[PDB]
C-alpha cells in the first residue's frame, strides 16, 4: 500500500501471522528534498530484517540531493521509520523525516530461510 | 383461448426478473439518507 | 483529471503520469483532496480504464486510378 511516515501509531493487517517468518523485507518509495536531473523519484528500497523479536524495527537512511554545482554541493538528508509487528499485523511506530514531501512504507515480504 | 377441439391442455409458466436500488428506490443508504445515487445496498429476484 | 459528480458518491479519476494513475498519487490526492471535498459528502478516487476498438471500414473512391499504398 502507501503509509504515510507521518502516520505514527497506525495499524495494518498482514497476510499472514508474522510468526509463520523468519525474516522479512520493508519497502520503502522516497521523495529526496531536492530534485536531481529534475527527478526527486527514488525508487522503492529494501531493508532487510532477521526478525529477533526487538519492539521496533528501524529503516533509517540517507539521500543525497540537488545537481552538483561549483558554488552549491548537493545537500544531504536523514530518513527514519520503525516498524513493529504482532501476529497478523503491523504498526508504523515512529519516524523523521527532513523535508516537506511525503515518504511512504509500501511492501512486507515475509522471507523464509530454512 | 383454448380452441375449442380436442385435448387442450391448460398450464401455467412463471417469469424472472432484477429489482436493483432503482426498481425499489429504498435499497438505497441508511448510515446516513435513502435516495441518491452512490447510496446502494440490496437488490431482488420477482418472477411473474 | 476528470470529475464525475453523483448526488451519492464524487468520482475523481485522472491519466496524469504518462497515460497511467499510480496506486501513491492515489493516497497523496486523496489526502489532498479533504479540505477541497464538501461536507458529508462522500469521496472516492479510482483509476481510468481504456476500451480498444476494433474496425475494418470500406471505402469508395470515384477514381479508382489513384489507389495506391501511400
Not at chain 1, 529534475?38 to 537512511?61: A, E, Q, R
Not at chain 1, 554545482?69 to 511506530?93: A, H, M, N, Q
Not at chain 3, 464524487?10 to 499510480?22: E, K, M, P
Amino acid at each position: 500500500g502507501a503509509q504515510s511516515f507521518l502516520s505514527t501509531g497506525t495499524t495494518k493487517n498482514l497476510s499472514d501471522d508474522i510468526s509463520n517468518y523468519s525474516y522479512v523485507e520493508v519497502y520503502t518509495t522516497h521523495k529526496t528534498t531536492e530534485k536531481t536531473k529534475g527527478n526527486d523519484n527514488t525508487g522503492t528500497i529494501c531493508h532487510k530484517f532477521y526478525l529477533d523479536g526487538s519492539g521496533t524495527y528501524v529503516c533509517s537512511g540517507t539521500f543525497v540531493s540537488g545537481d552538483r554545482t561549483d558554488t552549491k554541493p548537493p545537500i544531504t538528508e536523514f530518513y527514519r521509520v520503525g516498524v513493529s509487528f504482532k501476529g497478523s499485523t503491523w504498526t508504523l511506530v515512529d519516524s523523521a523525516v527532513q523535508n516537506s514531501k511525503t515518504q511512504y512504507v509500501t511492501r512486507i515480504i515475509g522471507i523464509n530461510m530454512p | 383461448k383454448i380452441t375449442g377441439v380436442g385435448k387442450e391442455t391448460i398450464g401455467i409458466k412463471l417469469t424472472e426478473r432484477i429489482v436493483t436500488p432503482d426498481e425499489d428506490a429504498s435499497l438505497l443508504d441508511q448510515t446516513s439518507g435513502v435516495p441518491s445515487y452512490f447510496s446502494k445496498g440490496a437488490d431482488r429476484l420477482e418472477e411473474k | 483529471v476528470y470529475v464525475y459528480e453523483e448526488t451519492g458518491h464524487i468520482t475523481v479519476f485522472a491519466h496524469d503520469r504518462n497515460g497511467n494513475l499510480s496506486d501513491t498519487l492515489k493516497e497523496d490526492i486523496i489526502d489532498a483532496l479533504q479540505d477541497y471535498r464538501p461536507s458529508g459528502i462522500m469521496l472516492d478516487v479510482t483509476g481510468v480504464e481504456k476500451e480498444e476498438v476494433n474496425v475494418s471500414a470500406t471505402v469508395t473512391i470515384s477514381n479508382k486510378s489513384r489507389i495506391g499504398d501511400t
